[PDB]
Amino acid sequence: YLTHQQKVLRLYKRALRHLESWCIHRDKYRYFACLLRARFDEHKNEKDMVKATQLLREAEEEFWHGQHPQPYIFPESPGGTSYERYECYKVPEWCLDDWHPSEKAMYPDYFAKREQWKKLRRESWEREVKQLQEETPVGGPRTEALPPARKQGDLPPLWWHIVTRPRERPM
Amino acid sequence: SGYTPEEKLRLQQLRELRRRWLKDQELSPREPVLPPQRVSPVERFWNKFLQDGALWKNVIYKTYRHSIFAFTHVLIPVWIIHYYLKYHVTTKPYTIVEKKPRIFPGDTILETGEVIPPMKEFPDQHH
């Protein structure tokens, strides 16, 4: 979940972003961005948690009533115009194993070096499994975070599909 | 409110692997190693001809390509279309139906040399 600290920061970011949409012009935004910062300052160091929640809970209602019906969204962010625009050009790396040798003959250096990575992934797998079979509690993982490499020469467990992932502009 | 020491170490190790993988995606100067292609003699004449980007030289190339296009995509098709319409499509009844041309007072009909009487006198409007 989100602690009370995280929920306040998120609302502050949303409040400024929607406010930026209403203001448009930078100078006007730089004015109401400071005034809105002040409203987050008059209660910066509240002590009573119950009072703090009632302040946060009331801010959300004012945010919902005041949010821009059509807020600005970055082009590549969820709901943005360019969101997932290049997901059709993102091919995985395993499709190169199905290439004809004639196609591979056009890139002798790339595929020679790609073979080295496949060897590196293949040699380090059995060690990665153990690294997770020992740090895991008796029952099973209680969180989604993976541990780093502990011994020199080892690679971070479960690294292939985050390291070899397609680029953001594949073509 | 930041990375734990374990998380920072993993990000660095993932970062160093990711950068090297991205580096390997670069092509060497030889690549792509294209197999031999039978170069047409005509294109050879233009490779040397276009060695220097002269304004007068590329104009000849511009006129050459357009002239070829005007022959393979306008002249040959219109020959086929005219032949098709001339001897196959206009030889059948009611295929191409032309709206009869307009006749105005005072016109002469080419087919029979007839003359259409002019209109009655316009009384007056001035304005």
Binding site: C95, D98, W99, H100, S102, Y110, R167 | -
Partner: peptide, 12 residues
């Protein structure tokens, strides 16, 4: 900088 474009086999 002339990177390698990963695409599915087009030979077949």
């Amino acid at each position: 900088k002339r990177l390698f474009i990963i695409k599915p086999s087009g030979f077949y």
